[PDB]
Amino acid sequence: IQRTPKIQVYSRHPAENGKSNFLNCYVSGFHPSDIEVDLLKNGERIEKVEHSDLSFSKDWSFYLLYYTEFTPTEKDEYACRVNHVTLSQPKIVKWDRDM
């Protein structure tokens, strides 16, 4: 009846400081469509964040893509925060420029 979401955080193009890019948080395989996703820069809910239109895979599970235009630096740390009914407590995944 329910399915917890799979998360993935990554950049549109290969991470390179000072150059424009896009931070992506991708949620899928989760069910009850209702879900809360936020992007975090140094821990703060990022202002302008858009997402794709809701949709579902073969097994009927849903999936969305939250993203924001950004420009990384050797210091600024980014992460994604996902909230869903199948979770005991919110889940956060740190961005990693290599994974």
Partner 1 sequence: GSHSLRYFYTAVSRPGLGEPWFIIVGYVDDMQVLRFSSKEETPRMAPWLEQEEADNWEQQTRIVTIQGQLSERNLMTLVHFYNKSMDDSHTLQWLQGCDVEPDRHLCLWYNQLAYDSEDLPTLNENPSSCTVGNSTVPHISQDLKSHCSDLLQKYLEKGKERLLRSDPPKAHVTRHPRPEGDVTLRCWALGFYPADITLTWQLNGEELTQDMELVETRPAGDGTFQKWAAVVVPLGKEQSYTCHVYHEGLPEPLILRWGG
Q: Which residues are near partner 1 by CB under 8 A? A: 1, 3, 6, 8, 10, 12-14, 22, 24, 26, 28-29, 31-34, 52-56, 60-62, 65, 67, 98-99
Structure tokens at 26: 């991708």
- What does the DSSP 8-state code read for residue 54? -
Nearer to partner 1, 31 or 81 (CB): 31
Q: How far is the CB of 87 from partner 1 (least distance, A)?
A: 17
Q: How far is the CB of 75 from partner 1 (least distance, A)?
A: 21
Burial of 3 (0-12, 13-18, 19+ CB in 10 A): middle
- What does the DSSP 8-state code read for residue 16? -
Q: How far is the CB of 33 from partner 1 (least distance, A)?
A: 6
- What does the DSSP 8-state code read for residue 52? -
